[PDB]
Amino acid sequence: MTIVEKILAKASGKKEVSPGDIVMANIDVAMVHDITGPLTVNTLKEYGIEKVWNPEKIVILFDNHILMRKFVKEQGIKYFYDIREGVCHQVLPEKGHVAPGEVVVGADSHTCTHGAFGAFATGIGSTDMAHVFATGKLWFKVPETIYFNITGDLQPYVTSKDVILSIIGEVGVDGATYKACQFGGETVKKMSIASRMTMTNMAIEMGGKTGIIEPDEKTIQYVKEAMKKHGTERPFEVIKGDEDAEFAEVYEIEADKIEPVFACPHNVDNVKQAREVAGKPIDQVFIGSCTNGRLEDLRMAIKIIEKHGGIADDVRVVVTPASREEYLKALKEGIIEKFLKYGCVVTNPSCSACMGSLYGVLGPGEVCVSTSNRNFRGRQGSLEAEIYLASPITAAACAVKGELVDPRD
Ligand SMILES: [Zn+2]
């Protein structure tokens, strides 16, 4: 019985569960952000429930507005954050709302990110969310874990981004469909929580239901620290998979021979190695995202840039910390100013002037190296623009030379 299965078993209140089995599980936290909030509320009452189940288990996002204020006020909803905590998923675990062995549901597709914390985390539609708000439970078709056992040491200039991009590259946009992608092995236990978030975030890009990574005391340290800092403290159990569990499509990845890659334009899953496509000129580099937007990413990228002393002219470098906290960390550490001084522009996620700038919008015939999730046509701009995906290191290197690279050159 897998970790996702022990989670769904404890949640449903069953003592055993199989893949394909269908259960009613209790929700630990539910999150709504933009359109889905108003939708969920209206959809919530044309039905007639006047009380949400647990006003402290719902997390909402703010900046028509009126229904949402009045909803949070009419309910007892304690956790509601402004959009200047950052547009990404970072906020939810940052404040300690995601603990191991928990069932987390959210409006956004990439809620799967929180699987990094050893919780079962999924995006759901508006109606499902309305049910959750009403009953604090939801139906789940119990998935199957496909286990990716990653062992070996990451070579220099190689990040979990290259790892997950390679994995996606051999499994295609599908899949990994009705199934949960579970990452493990020594290479996974060695990487940081940030690095794990990078992978779990991109799980659904394989068409996966969610990514999940088993917890260890990096996970514990993170969660406990966040909980004490934000007063979101609450007991949790550490649910981890048994060797008594079986997996559709166990893969084996060895991080030794993984080298810096690219997700080449319009599709995430093609994934050609850096050397092959190297040399093509680029007019923009986008560093930071929900995928790699955290402190370690900024740190390695600015390290690369700094060592070679600045960026190529006639290239637009855009640096976007995943959240306000991450931004403040990078600020306090001098990283933000190093970026600024080298000619990059940094978007302060709490600044509307920063957030509304069109400076990073790709025009026709423009090439961009991005550290984000998605390279499909028209994503960052014109549909006649193309987008390569990379780790912060590879991206930084591209910003240094001003065309497509392999970080070691
Ligand atoms: Zn600003």
Q: Give yes or no: residues 203 and 276 share one domain.
A: no
- Alpha carbon of 352 to ligand 1 centroid (Å): 7
- ω before 390 within 30° of 0 (cis)? no
Q: Give yes or no: residues 320 and 232 share one domain.
A: no
- Alpha carbon of 355 to ligand 1 centroid (Å): 7
- Alpha carbon of 341 to ligand 1 centroid (Å): 15
- Alpha carbon of 147 to ligand 1 centroid (Å): 42
Q: Give yes or no: residues 362 and 336 share one domain.
A: yes
Other CB atoms closer than 10 Å to residue 28's CB: what's the count?
A: 23
- Alpha carbon of 62 to ligand 1 centroid (Å): 19
Strand partners, 360: none
Q: Give yes or no: residues 134 and 255 share one domain.
A: yes
Binding residues: 290, 351, 354
Binding residues for [4Fe-4S] cluster: 290, 351, 354
The rounded distance, in Å, linking the Cα atoms of 308 and 191 is 26
- Alpha carbon of 71 to ligand 1 centroid (Å): 31
Final residue belonging to a domain, choices 237, 260, 283 = 260
The rounded distance, in Å, linking the Cα atoms of 374 and 277 is 19
Q: Give yes or no: residues 170 and 293 share one domain.
A: no
| Dihedral of the alpha carbons of 39, 41, 47, 50, in degrees to the nearest 10 | 180
The rounded distance, in Å, linking the Cα atoms of 319 and 169 is 26
Q: Give yes or no: residues 303 and 209 share one domain.
A: no
- Alpha carbon of 351 to ligand 1 centroid (Å): 5
- Alpha carbon of 33 to ligand 1 centroid (Å): 22
Q: How many domains does the chain have?
A: 2
- Alpha carbon of 354 to ligand 1 centroid (Å): 4
Q: Give yes or no: residues 185 and 203 share one domain.
A: yes
Q: Give yes or no: residues 254 and 267 share one domain.
A: no
- Alpha carbon of 226 to ligand 1 centroid (Å): 26
Cβ-based burial of 407 (10 A; exposed 0-12, middle 13-18, buried ≥19): buried
Strands 180-184 and 145-151: parallel
Helical residues (DSSP H) of 251-407, grouped into ranges: 274-277, 295-307, 324-332, 335-341, 352-356, 392-401
Pair of tokens at residue 367? 């090439």
CATH number at residue 210: 3.30.499.10
- Alpha carbon of 353 to ligand 1 centroid (Å): 5
- ω before 231 within 30° of 0 (cis)? no
Final residue belonging to a domain, choices 207, 236, 260 = 260
Q: Give yes or no: residues 66 and 18 share one domain.
A: yes
> At how many degrees (to 10) do helices 392-401 and 295-307 cross?
30
Q: Give yes or no: residues 87 and 22 share one domain.
A: yes
Q: Give yes or no: residues 29 and 164 share one domain.
A: yes
- Alpha carbon of 344 to ligand 1 centroid (Å): 13
- Alpha carbon of 87 to ligand 1 centroid (Å): 15
- Alpha carbon of 82 to ligand 1 centroid (Å): 16
- Alpha carbon of 323 to ligand 1 centroid (Å): 14
Final residue belonging to a domain, choices 196, 225, 260 = 260
Cβ-based burial of 333 (10 A; exposed 0-12, middle 13-18, buried ≥19): middle
Mind giving me the DSSP string for 184-241? ESHHHHHS-HHHHHHHHHHGGGGT-SEEEE---HHHHHHHHHHHHHHT----------
Biggest distance spanned by C-alpha atoms of the chain:
64
Q: Give yes or no: residues 45 and 183 share one domain.
A: yes
Domain that holds residue 232: 2-260
The answer to whether 228 and 136 are in contact (CB under 8 A) is: no
Method: X-ray
- The resolution in angstroms reads 2.6
Q: In 3-state terms, what secondary structure has residue 71?
A: helix
Element housing 134 (H / E): helix 126-135
